[PDB]
Amino acid sequence: IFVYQNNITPSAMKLVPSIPPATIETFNEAALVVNITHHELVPKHIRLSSDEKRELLKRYRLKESQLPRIQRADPVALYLGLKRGEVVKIIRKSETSGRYASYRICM
Amino acid sequence: KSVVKTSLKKNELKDGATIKEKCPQCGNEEMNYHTLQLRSADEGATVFYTCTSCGYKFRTNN
Amino acid sequence: YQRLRHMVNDKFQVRSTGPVNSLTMQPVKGRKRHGGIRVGEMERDALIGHGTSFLLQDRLLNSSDYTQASVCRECGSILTTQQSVPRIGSISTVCCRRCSMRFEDAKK
Amino acid sequence: MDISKPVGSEITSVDFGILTAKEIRNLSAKQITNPTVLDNLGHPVSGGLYDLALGAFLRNLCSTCGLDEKFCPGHQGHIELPVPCYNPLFFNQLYIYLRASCLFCHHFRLKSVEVHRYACKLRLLQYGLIDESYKLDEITLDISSTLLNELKSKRSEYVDMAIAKALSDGRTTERGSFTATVNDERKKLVHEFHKKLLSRGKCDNCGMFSPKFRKDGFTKIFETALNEKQITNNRVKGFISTYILSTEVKNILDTVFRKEQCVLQYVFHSRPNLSRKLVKADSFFMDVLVVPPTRFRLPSKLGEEVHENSQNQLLSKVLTTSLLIRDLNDDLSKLRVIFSRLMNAFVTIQNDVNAFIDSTKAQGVPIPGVKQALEKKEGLFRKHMMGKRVNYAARSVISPDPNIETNEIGVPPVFAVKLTYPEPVTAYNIAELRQAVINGPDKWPGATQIQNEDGSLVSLIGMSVEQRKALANQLLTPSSNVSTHTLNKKVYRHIKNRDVVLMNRQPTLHKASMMGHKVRVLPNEKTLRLHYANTGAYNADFDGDEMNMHFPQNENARAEALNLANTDSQYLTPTSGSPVRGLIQDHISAGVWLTSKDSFFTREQYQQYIYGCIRPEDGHTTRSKIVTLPPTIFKPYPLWTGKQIITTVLLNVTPPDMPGINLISKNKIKNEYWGKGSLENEVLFKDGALLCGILDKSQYGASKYGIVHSLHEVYGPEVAAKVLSVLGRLFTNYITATAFTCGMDDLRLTAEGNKWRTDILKTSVDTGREAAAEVTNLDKDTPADDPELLKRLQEILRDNNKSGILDAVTSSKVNAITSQVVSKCVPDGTMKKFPCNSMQAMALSGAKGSNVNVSQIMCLLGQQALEGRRVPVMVSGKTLPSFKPYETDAMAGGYVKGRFYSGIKPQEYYFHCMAGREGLIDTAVKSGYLQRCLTKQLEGVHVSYDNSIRDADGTLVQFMYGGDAIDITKESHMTQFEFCLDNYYALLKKYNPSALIEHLDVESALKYSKKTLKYRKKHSKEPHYKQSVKYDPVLAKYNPAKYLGSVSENFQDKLESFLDKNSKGVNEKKFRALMQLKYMRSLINPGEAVGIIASQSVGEPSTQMTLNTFNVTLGIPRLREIVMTASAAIKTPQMTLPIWNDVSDEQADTFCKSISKVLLSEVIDKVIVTETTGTARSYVIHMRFFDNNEYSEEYDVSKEELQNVISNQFIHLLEAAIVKEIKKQKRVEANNNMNKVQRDRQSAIISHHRFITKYNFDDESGKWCEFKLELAADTEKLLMVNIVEEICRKSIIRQIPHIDRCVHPEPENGKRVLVTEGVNFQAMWDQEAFIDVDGITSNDVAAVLKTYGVEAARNTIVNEINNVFSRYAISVSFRHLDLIADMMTRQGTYLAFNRQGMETSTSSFMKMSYETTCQFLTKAVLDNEREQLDSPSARIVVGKLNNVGTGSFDVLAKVPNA
Ligand SMILES: [Zn+2]
Ligand SMILES: [Zn+2]
Ligand SMILES: [Zn+2]
Ligand SMILES: [Zn+2]
Secondary structure (H helix, E strand, O other), rough: OOOEOOOOOOOOOHHHHOOOOOOEEEEEEEOOOHHHOOOOOOOEEOOOOOOHHHHHHHHHHOOHHHOOOOOOHHHHHHHHHHOOOEEEEEEEEEOOOOOEEEEEEEE | OOOOOOOOOOOOOOOOOOOOOOOOOOOOOOOEEEEOOOOOOOOOEEEEEOOOOOOOOEEEOO | OOOOOOOOOOOEEEEEEOEOOOOOEEOOOOOOOOOOOEOHHHHHHHHOOOOHHHHHHHHHOOOOOEEEEEOOOOOOOOOOEEEOOOOOOOOOOOOOOOOOOOOOOOOO | OOOOOOOOOOOOEEEOOOOOOHHHHOOOOEEEOOOOOOOOOOOEOOOOOOOOOOOOOOOOOOOOOOOOOOOOOOOEEEEEEEEEEEEEHHHHHHHHHHEEEOOOOOOEOOHHHHHHHHHHHHHHHOOOOOHHHOHHHHOOOOOOHHHHHHHHHHHHHHHHHHHHHHHHOOOOOOOOOHHHHHHHHHHHHHHHHHHHHOOOOOOOOOOOOOOOEOOOOOOOOOEEEOOHHHHHOOOHHHOOOOOOOHHHHHHHHHHHHHOOHHHHHHHHOOOOOOOOOOOOOOOOOOEEEEOOHHHHHHOOOOOEEEEOOOOHHHHHHHHHHHHHHHOOOOOOHOOHHHHHHHHHHHHHHHHHHHHHHHOOOOOOOOOOOOHHHHOOOOOHHHOOOOOOEEEEEEEEEEOOOOOOOOEEEEHHHHHHHOOOOEOOOOOOOOOHHHHHHOOOOOOOEEEEEEOOOOEEEEEHHHHHHHHHHHHHHOOOOOOHHHHHHOOOEEEEEOOOOOOEEEEOOOOOOOOOHHHEEEEEEEEOOOOEEEEEHHHHHOOOOOOOOOOEEEEOOOHHHHHHHHOOEEEEHHEEOOOOOOOOOOOOHHHHHHHHHHOOOEEEEEEEHHHHHHHHHHHHHHOOOOOOOOOOOOEEEOOOOEEHHHEEEHHHHHHOOOOOOOOOEEEEEEOOOOOHHHHOOOOOOOEEOOOEEEEEEEOHHHHHHOOOOOOOHHHHHHOOOOHHHHHHHHHHHHHHHHHOOOOOOOHHHHHOOOOHHHHHHHHHHHOHHHHHHHHHHOOOOOOOOOOOOHHHHHHHHHHHOOHHHHHHHHHHHEEEEEEHHHHHHHHHHOOOOEEOOOOHHHHHHHHHOOOOHHHHHHHHOOOOOOOOOOOOOOOOOOOOOOOOOOOOOOOOOOOOEEEEOOOOOOOOOOOHHHHHHHHHHHHHHHHHHOOOHHHHHHHHHHHHOEEOOOOOOOOOOOOEOOHHHHHHOOOOOOOOOOHHHHHHHHOHHHHHHHOOOOOOOOOOEOOHHHHHHHHHHHHHHOOOOOOOOOOOOOOOOOHHHHOOOOOOOOOOOHHHHHHHHHHOOOOOOOOHHHHHHHHHHHOOOOEEOOOOOOHHHHHHHHHHHHHHHOOOOOOOOOOOHHHHHHHHHHOOOOOOOOEEEEEEOOOHHHHHHHHHHHOOOOEEEHHHHEEEEEEEOOOEEEEEEEEEEHHHHHHOOOHHOHHHHHHHHHHHHHHHHHHHHHHHHHHHHHOOOOOOOOOHHHHHHHHHHHHHOOEEEEEEEEOOOOEEEEEEEOOOOOOOOOOHHHHHHHHHOOOOOOOOOOEEEEEEEOOOEOEEEEEEEEEOOOHHHOOOOOOOOOOOEEOOHHHHHHHHHHHHHHHHHHHHHHHHHHHHOOOHHHHHHHHEEEEEEOOOOOOOEEEEHHOOOOOOHHHHOOOOOHEEEEEHHHOOOEEOOOOOHHHHOOOOOOOHHHOOOOOOOOOOOO
């Protein structure tokens, strides 16, 4: 995780996905002032294991992409550090059912 | 700098129109109303009720 | 009291099986011409709404332009199929113009 | 459709492709070469458009199949184009590939390794693997060919391995996986590929430059210009505008499509190319034209005139040009001019086929092309596929009828003798059909036709009783032919009283406007008769309305109209789960009288009212003998009460096996109207007996938790229907014996009451001037004729805002006088009083009208409001020529003291007319397109057998409907625990568990429910982010239809809370099981089209909000901002900031001002420019601001803050504005001896400013800013004041980005909040001392998505749509909103219900039937797409049964023999 102050050079930004399997994540300290997952409208997002995903895709007979989507650059997706393929479990409070578990695939 | 009133105060503007009607929320006597002829010239008039205790708007023709 | 000039149903109509347009093969427009009542997109939506798939099939197909048409399984088309012209004793058979080869061209 | 004619073959999928010239030449029935259509005499010319080889025409037999005009299907022909032509639809694409290719090495100018990278990514995307396509970019080693070829090898190795690995598992099939997100990733790449392809100038393979290709509107390509620097490299290429023919372009693309075949293989194939077909360039070119069969090109006949074929006109013109140009090029062989007309002919043939296909993209009325034919108006798909004119249907004006059943329709005998059903003759119905056959087509119940087993038809129309009798005795004869022994004869019998019909009242805004009714043929009728209970659902008033009757022609369609779309199941609408069925007017007024204490009845009268509405012979009874209660009065005379009739009707219609209904409800009529100490408002039902209270619109109307609704929940829908029909008859019979009338006596006030009216209205004269004196701000209340007041009112007249303040104040004051009159006079001042005052009775009962209408009749009309304000006023200050200019009277403003009983004064009447006309125009001027956009994108969305909400293509939208899987038409008494308790044994018998206990689990879910409740109670005070994620909800782990206890935590909390707060032979444990079982039986059925239902539930009630405002965007425009356009640029963007408790009301208002920002314009009072022309144009600009303490207390701006802005921003902005204006033209107190610190400041400013020369600012007091500007002698005249003015209102001293104003409204539902007129979260994040950063709400969805994520934006959509409905007091189930929001957020973005959002959808047929049919078709062909026919639209296009509801499964027959 690299917390930068104002801006990063376009040449320096190319060096971010240059060393696999190691991953690099950049964040502006002004954007980290307030935690987004602490907001009342942002439910609890939980990243699922390769086994938990495998089980979910079986119960509903789903294909990776056949699921609701979460963008790889989505604020919460960037917070949990989601990679493409990773499934996230969303426990959201409904004004009809209360606690409800939904899911989203990061592509 | 204008001698006449240019702006209204935060709460110094009371709702004038009031009619005796049972409140469905809890049970109040005083209730505000509004009139406007919607739809065709054959269709009736719609009444827009408003509560004074909470401040809840409403819409029912009959 | 005043009696208004309009008949109550001047647009009063009933159609069982009346004339159809050549292109769509669907009931033609016109009350006096024994025309059909239109089942528009909203009525289609309502029949989808009830989850009533046979009522939709009944209006938008069965009682509209339902045609049992010949299709070639080899090339998948309704426009290349045609009824063959048989000899004095032989029977006519549905044949595809696309998949069939000209007799002379069939060489070994 | 014939059931005797089954079909064994079916279309499973449609493949989009391009016809090859070689393919067309072989299938062609005849080559068309002649532009003439007819020979002399009248026979079609050989080689022409009407050739008999193209099918039977002009009573001649087809020369291909030999059949006549009826049986001949028609045959396709072809036109041989002498030169290849660009196909108009694919010109844009071939153009992209032409500009992207090198004219030397004949490869794309993009580097081979980069091209291979796209081919790799696109191959991996043929299969559903997006993650792998991105992982390919990670594979990395002016660069040598030996190194780059190794990169291509390593990349190809990963592609081959990733495909095989996923192929081994169930990740992708041999045919490849294809989803909307996969499609989104493909569409993104194919776009990026073409963008990179077009960007390259110099070829990366061979460094030589290619000449740029330019294009015009029509299909024609040409050469480009070329500077000297470009020339210097085109000559060193070998060292190391002109038109281009169609043949040259085809030849360039021929080689390029061969050399770049590997990438184009995946660029043009959506899924893997299993057919192994070569991607050839000649697909974009037309060497031939297919000639459609004569059948689809027939000349239109209108009466006597036979119009020339619309298609044959332009098509013959193409043939004339083709023959003319092939001969005008043939004489050139024996040879400038001949080349000139040859090229000109080459252009007019391409423009001829372009005109043959399209217009708007031709000419500049021309003949419409085939693209125009598919998009004439709404289009062929919308006008003739998604919608169609139908057979066996009728239309008529509806007339009311209370004597028919609520589930019936009165069919006129005219329709009954024309509408027939194909009834197959059998042993069980030979008797019934023999009679129909004898009766014939004019005697009901008859038959119009008889279909034999051989397939032939025998019309009974012309036949006499003798032939009909003979055919009837030949109906059940055994089939001699073995080829039809399976079949039996059919009788096309008249519509009987046992048939189903689909009643439709347009617009069909919701599925309740299209229900199934039971046919009841009524003799001597000329109109469709309909019961009053149906009035609500159809939204049909008997004001000369028309209704459509559809007669479905098969048993599967019958069953559907009798069990799914039938009227009985429509008692509750799925929008809010509230009733849409009930009695409407006479019946409501009848009930208030019949159930009144004063209503008594003798034995003779009582028994008559019972049999009058309950007939055992018509199956109305449940006891086979009419049971009667004893009288309420025994001595002196035996008498029955009115309420006892209601008890007896229930006693004979409700089952004997079940106990009587127990309900404690309320009335619309208050106890005060029924006298002292009455309890007649409390509706009381104890063991099915009306013991207290009358029955209103609130009981047997379409109103929730009334008697009919209570009966519906305890005894079911069939009983509630019986009760409605029974009550409907009783009140009709009661209104016949005991009538109801309205007259003048019901409109009069008493002498006492009329005195009150005149006295309260006597204070209204002062009100006019009082309010006029308040807004104007004048003490001691100045006279009406005051000269200062009249000058002050003029100031108000000229300003739209100032007049608004005057109108709103005067209106509120006069409306307060109105309310007083009404409250006093009605009802305590009315001469005739309730129940006898029928005018009053109708308003209180809810039969018709309200107390507002009653008050306009008996008291006053009140203030006539026009577009939110009072009466419009002229420039003279007069509201009418009768009133004085600037009259301070209520009457002059539109306040009507007169009533409709006494009459309106001429002055008052004119004002009323303005108000009336305004109401009328809004109805005419002001949900069709909003609903159409939602329904087309949600049609496929339904409930799957795995309880999840899945789209047509199987993609998951929701894991569970509303998160609990409950049907809204069931979620009503599910929280009505006391009701369910009082009816325990009745509901336990309803939800029969004895036949279910062996099919379900009774503990698994119940144990888990306790474990989740345990961890929930542990983190009660804890916030949502810190809450335990150990155990997720019981519904997530256990199927609600298989496990008793897998209930929503909302239901669980509510149920447990009832058992704790209410301690009451039913145990608290056996009741819990019943409610658990009720939830199980309240589940939404798999197959239910929740998509259409949701859009109908948002569409239909959004018609009620067509009226204008009485700041933020409301109604349909706000709903359009969300659903239809998903705007990132909202009209009224806002932020709701929750303020802490430690921040006071004064502190918050100071904070509002701080966010609040002033501009230079806002602090300036006057600007004086003293233009002196000298030497040099001297401009003395003096800035007279407001007092230092004034703007510092109004804008929180200091004098220091003002100094910095003028010395740095304003002067630099002013200098730039003057210079720009020069170019555009040519294209009291005395201050002297300024000193020291001030002198150093002035000298430093002179060095920084070119023309001011001087700069003096009030540093002590802070009231002025003076600066001198020096211009040249050539600058001459200039309007400096106007120049300065514009820059001042452009100069910012203050402002927080994207925010305009922060206000402090009244606490919303107890929450202390601040509403911002702008959106910037990061700025509010810094105000943590004032705002709770975890509760900062915003209406802007896109802004929320950008900062807080997709789930937050999703929650904003469901809240914002709810705000639109809650304002108009409309309740829409959150299950609908959540579905809509989930569909908008399906891609992780914010998609709207429009062409843009739809782009990421599998069905090209669904897309084609929405808009731009030919455009979506082109995109489908280029993808080589397979339409899987899984969307409702696609299925309708190909005549396949819809996969929703009854089409969500298959029916198989169990056969005994092996
Ligand atoms: Zn209230
Ligand atoms: Zn074929
Ligand atoms: Zn033919
Ligand atoms: Zn090249």
